[PDB]
Design a protein around this ligand. Structure first.
Ligand SMILES: Nc1ncnc2c1ncn2[C@@H]1O[C@H](COP(=O)(O)OP(=O)(O)NP(=O)(O)O)[C@@H](O)[C@H]1O
Ligand SMILES: [Mg+2]
Lengths: 584, 572
């Protein structure tokens, strides 16, 4: 659709240079195409010349004995023209696709190595559409738009040169339609762009009204808002009818207008040509040849003008892709060492962290965990008990203070061993659209399914898993949509168990679980933590009682600590939270 | 069955526009078909006979015909635009008018996502189809048929070469379509796979990272990357061979015209101008035949929109007010269920069954049960959003099927599980229950809903902007916003479907305690899957697996109601 504004360029040549680097291994092949496009465009301007020449040599002097010779040359000129199009096309097809394949490979590798922060800042839908469109823009311009733009140049120049070498005046007559084409196109273009966007504005509003009203129909009916909603729809719709008609008009008048310019050219060539034939200044075949050029200066000009705009639009997208490829990557340290087989000591020392560096999230957090101890970090929303998990998994890094596991600072540890020695079951973990057996295997690749079923029983999963349509072979499309949430929390528990880390973080939800599975998920929690250090964002009564340590959080500050019974008596904050929720 | 609704009625009131567009287009076509004959006249009857007037006057005449055909084409576009646009406006309105009347069960059939695409995309598709029918659907087949007429008009014999040129082209189009269709569809399958792998890697990045499985994901992206590459080469190699072969056939058209026509001028049966006119008519016929092929490709996709749009237009609303429905100037808040059974789809077992219970006006009752016990459905029966399959539902001892919907719903306020807000201002959203509501009354409700302080700390406060769906507010403040919105209505029945999901446990009690002093004289239902919340109400209704298990207080239920014990066991 009609472009809004021309893209800003942070030196297009540097990005051009870089983008041309992807074309270096296929240079020999790329030269070959340019000469194909070159010769196939020249042979394309020769055709209407021979048609005039045949008329002048074979038809007019009645010298028909020369006909099979002229038709043989044409028949091969044509054959080669289409032979070259097929080559030029199929060569660039698997050439440009081989490029964006690389770009797709590289961008995805960037995904698995970029800091997790970028996925937390910008919406996932945005960063895929913006990226996949940019990749497509390159693909479009590389495989089609460039060679079509080049062909347009050779063809256009080829026709003008040969036109002038036949007759100068008739060339000036034909080229008279160029300023008409440019004047007309420019005017219609601006109008089309204007009302395109004016219509896009009103339509997006109208569509907005539709999407939300259908999604919130139940509310609209509860508030008996049908009429008011209908009235809101009407006034926009009635105004879309009016603008859409205008957008539709100006987006549709360039073809009859271009056609007219073609017919105006045909007329001039026929009149001025025929009137130059009646003075022996030109031949009749000459007139035929110029007619063969009468449409060469309308739409092919516009194609050039718009293929040029796709080029710009492409380079801008190239400039975006390269920057994503230039982002910093999570690398380890040369002094970062592998984890010794310890039992799991965790420690925070006056740690400060936030996300936007303006509003603090954790302020002066300091605590110590002993190997084996189940620890429950409790608190209301706005505490930071969830922010703990990220810092401890090094998805983020602390600003002030330091976190350390088993005596060595977490930032001086290889991420590989750290994330192997530490498990994690987030509040709403993510499953994959594969099989149950494959999902539970995700933690330990080299683990036989005979061993999995043995471990699947030790978390209360083996029952409902075999009661599935295809048992363990069952494919759970859309990340377990056909499974109840309670069953998926189980699968997450079974999965984390198979990885077998010596440190555990747990955020088991309690909200929408059925009481049956509820007793089996907590039984699974006991077998889960059996043998390792555990940190639990608790929402259950029977876990904050068995807690070897409770650490109470509030407003980013660690306020209270100590065991359950002890914290009830202080009457400070834990007692509040407890009696204002368990004081039934 | 199905329905007799028809989309050809949205065009009827613009029939004048719908007939001028094709007529104006034929003028363009006649003017476009005239040029090669006038050229042949210039050479055969002008140059050949040496008279300037002939060449001059027909030369001028070709200009006049060009502009005339220009008026033709613009006039078609203009008129087709009106007809096209008014059609889509009229279509869209009724589509929206229908959807507004739909019930839970209606929406349950055309899923909400498909419903939106049916009113947005399909409406534009159909708009385009009508635009198309009134311009190029007239143009192309007229050039094709008129071009053949002209060639026949110039020389019957030479026209036989059209019998040789047309079948291979049609055969080419048939082959390309039948072979390219499943190969293009294969691209969509390979594209979605690329999209899925990227999404799941974004979605569960912390999972793939922590499990040290990044390299396994690169491996799985290569499979989707290669499949997409493969399916795109194999498909577009067809197109990349189709276009040059089409042009070749057309160019051998020229060859045949000059060769077969060459032996016709030699026999003094066809002048030299007629050959020039014939070559142009030849290209006209061929390119038009190509445009017709593309039209055919779009129609088959367009009609899928016609069917989808028609299904909505043919859908009867499941909930209807009776002709002589009772008016309810007031409601006490008595609410009863007698042997209520409910099912969403008739392939499953009931989601409610043998539901028998009553509630005196003014009472605060906690409806409590595990996940999927039927609580939300049970509540949905009260404002006639759904109907019992068996049994009935009463409000003030009246079957709700008997009372006016605007009346019944005007006295019931619900607070749905999933919270939805609407574009505009906070004050606009909150006044959804009362447009005569004053600011004091609104602040009142928001205070009880524990949201007035959040609102008051906004730069524009109550005039702050609500973005589509309430996306700019968190789940916590949205919930509270709708609670306030519920209370401004001043209901005689108040339903709170699990609406403590996104607030602090402490803030929760603050909300519910204030209801007592503001819902003074209001039958209240408080729906929850957790016992502490249910204990706030005077009496607890316990649902388990679609049936009512018990109805009393904590002591009674702890002794006699076994499903209540299971809940207690799972929580304490
Ligand atoms: N719109 C719908 N279409 C079809 N089935 C539904 C629909 N809504 C709910 N169901 C099913 O009907 C049963 C009862 O649903 P519902 O009354 O929503 O459970 P609930 O316990 O009130 N919700 P929650 O408390 O949040 O778990 C469940 O098994 C649902 O799967
Ligand atoms: Mg519910």
């Amino acid at each position: 659709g009609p472009i809004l504004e021309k893209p800003a360029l942070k030196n297009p040549t540097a990005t051009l240079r870089r983008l041309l680097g992807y074309l270096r291994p296929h240079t020999f092949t790329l030269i070959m195409v340019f000469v194909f496009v070159t010769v196939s465009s020249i042979l394309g301007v020769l055709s209407p010349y021979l048609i005039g020449k045949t008329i002048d040599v074979v038809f007019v002097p009645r010298r028909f004995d020369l006909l099979p010779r002229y038709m043989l040359i044409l028949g091969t000129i044509y054959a080669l023209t289409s032979l070259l199009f097929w080559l030029q096309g199929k060569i660039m097809l698997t050439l440009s696709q081989d490029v964006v394949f690389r770009l797709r490979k590289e961008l995805f590798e960037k995904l698995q190595r970029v800091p997790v922060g970028f996925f937390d800042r910008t919406p996932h839908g945005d960063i895929i559409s913006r990226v996949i469109n940019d990749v497509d823009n390159i693909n479009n311009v590389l495989g089609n738009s460039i060679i079509q733009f080049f062909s347009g140049i050779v063809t256009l120049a080829g026709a003008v040169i040969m036109m002038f070498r036949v007759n100068v005046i008739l060339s000036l007559v034909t080229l008279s339609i160029v300023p008409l084409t440019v004047l007309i196109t420019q005017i219609v273009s601006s109008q089309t762009r204007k009302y395109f966007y004016e219509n896009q504005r009103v339509l997006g509003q109208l569509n907005g009204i539709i999407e939300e009203d259908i999604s919130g129909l139940t509310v609209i009916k509860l508030f008996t808002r049908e009429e008011k909603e209908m009235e809101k729809f009407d006034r926009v719709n009635e105004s879309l009818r009016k603008v859409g008609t205008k957008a539709q008009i100006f987006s549709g008048v360039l073809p009859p207008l271009m056609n007219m310019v073609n017919n105006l050219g045909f007329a001039l060539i026929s009149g001025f040509g025929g009137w130059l034939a009646l003075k022996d200044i030109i031949t009749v075949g000459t007139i035929a040849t110029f007619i063969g050029y009468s449409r060469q200066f309308t739409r092919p000009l516009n194609e050039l003008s718009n293929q040029f705009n796709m080029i710009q639009m492409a380079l801008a997208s190239a400039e975006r892709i390269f920057e994503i490829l230039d982002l910093e990557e999570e690398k380890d340290d040369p002094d970062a060492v592998e984890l010794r087989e310890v039992r799991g000591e965790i420690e925070f020392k006056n740690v400060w962290f936030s996300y936007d560096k303006k509003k603090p999230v954790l302020k002066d957090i300091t605590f110590h965990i002993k190997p084996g101890q189940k620890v429950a970090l409790v608190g209301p929303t706005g505490s930071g008990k969830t922010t703990i998990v990220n810092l401890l998994m090094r998805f983020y890094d602390v600003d002030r203070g330091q976190i350390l596991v088993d005596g060595i600072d977490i930032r001086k540890i290889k991420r590989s061993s750290l994330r192997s020695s530490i498990g994690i079951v987030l509040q709403d973990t993510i499953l994959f659209s594969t099989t149950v057996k494959e999902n539970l295997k995700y933690g330990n690749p080299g683990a036989t399914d005979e061993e999995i079923k043995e471990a699947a029983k030790l978390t209360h999963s083996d029952h409902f898993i075999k009661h599935l349509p295809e048992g363990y072979e069952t494919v759970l499309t859309d990340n377990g949509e056909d499974l109840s949430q309670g069953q998926r929390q189980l699968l997450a528990i079974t999965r984390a168990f198979l990885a077998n880390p010596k440190i555990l973080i747990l955020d088991e939800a309690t909200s929408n679980v059925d009481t049956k599975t509820e007793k089996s998920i907590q039984a699974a929690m006991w077998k889960l933590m059996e043998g390792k250090t555990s940190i639990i964002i608790a929402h259950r009564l029977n876990t904050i009682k068995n807690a070897d340590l409770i650490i109470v959080l509030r407003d980013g500050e660690i306020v209270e600590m100590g065991k359950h019974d002890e914290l009830i008596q202080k009457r400070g904050f834990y007692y509040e939270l407890f009696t204002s929720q368990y004081g039934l | 069955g199905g329905g007799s609704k028809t989309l050809a009625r949205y065009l009827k009131p613009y029939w004048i526009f719908a007939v001028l567009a094709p007529l104006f287009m034929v003028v363009e076509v006649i003017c476009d078909l005239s040029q090669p004959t006038l050229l042949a006249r210039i050479v055969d009857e002008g140059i050949a006979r040496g008279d300037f007037s002939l060449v001059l006057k027909t030369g001028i005449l070709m200009l006049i015909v060009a502009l005339i055909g220009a008026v033709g084409g613009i006039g078609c576009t203009v008129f087709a635009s009106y007809a096209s646009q008014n059609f889509g406006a009229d279509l869209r309105r009724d589509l929206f008018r229908k959807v507004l009347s739909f019930s839970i069960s209606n929406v349950n059939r055309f899923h909400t996502s498909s419903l939106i695409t049916r009113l947005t995309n399909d409406v534009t598709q159909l708009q385009n189809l009508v635009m198309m029918l009134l311009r190029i659907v007239v143009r192309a087949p007229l050039l094709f048929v008129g071009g053949i007429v002209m060639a026949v008009s110039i020389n019957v014999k030479l026209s036989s070469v059209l019998i040789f040129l047309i079948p291979p082209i049609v055969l080419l189009f048939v082959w390309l379509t039948k072979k390219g269709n499943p190969l293009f569809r294969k691209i969509q399958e390979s594209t979605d796979e690329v999209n899925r792998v990227v999404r799941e890697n974004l979605l569960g990045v912390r999972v793939v990272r922590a499990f040290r499985r990044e390299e396994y994901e690169n491996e799985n992206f290569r499979k989707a990357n290669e499949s997409l590459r493969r399916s795109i080469i194999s498909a577009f190699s067809l197109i990349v061979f189709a276009l040059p072969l089409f042009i070749f056939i057309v160019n051998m058209g020229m060859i045949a015209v000059l060769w077969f026509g060459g032996v016709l001028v030699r026999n003094n049966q066809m002048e030299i101008g007629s050959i020039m006119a014939y070559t142009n008519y030849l290209m006209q016929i061929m390119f038009s035949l190509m445009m017709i092929g593309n039209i055919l490709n779009f129609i088959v996709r367009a009609s899928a929109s016609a069917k989808r749009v028609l299904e909505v237009l043919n859908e009867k609303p499941a909930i209807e007010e009776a002709d002589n429905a009772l008016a309810l100037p007031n409601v006490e808040g008595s609410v009863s269920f007698e042997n209520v059974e409910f099912r969403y789809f008739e392939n499953t077992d009931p989601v409610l069954s043998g539901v028998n219970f009553s509630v005196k006006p003014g009472s605060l009752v906690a409806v409590l049960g595990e996940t999927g016990s039927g609580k939300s459905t049970l509540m949905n029966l009260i404002p006639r959003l759904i109907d019992p399959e068996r049994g009935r539902v009463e409000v003030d001892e009246l079957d709700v099927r008997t009372v006016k919907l605007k009346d019944l719903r005007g006295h019931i306020s619900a607070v749905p599980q999933e919270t939805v807000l609407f574009s505009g201002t906070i004050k606009e959203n909150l006044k959804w229950g009362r447009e005569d509501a004053t600011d004091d009354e609104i602040v009142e409700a928001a205070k009880i809903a524990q949201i007035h302080d959040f609102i008051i700390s906004l730069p524009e406060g109550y005039d702050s902007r609500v973005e589509r769906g309430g996306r700019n507010f968190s789940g916590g403040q949205k919930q509270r916003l709708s609670i306030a919105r519920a209370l401004v209505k001043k209901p005689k029945v108040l339903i709170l479907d699990d609406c403590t999901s996104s607030v602090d446990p402490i803030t929760e009690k603050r909300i519910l305690d204030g209801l007592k002093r503001y819902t003074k004289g209001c039958t209240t239902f408080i729906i929850t899957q957790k016992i502490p919340t249910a204990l706030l109400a005077d009496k607890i209704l316990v649902l388990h697996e679609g049936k009512v298990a018990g109805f009393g207080t904590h002591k009674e239920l702890l002794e006699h109601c076994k499903p209540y014990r299971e809940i207690y066991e799972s929580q304490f």
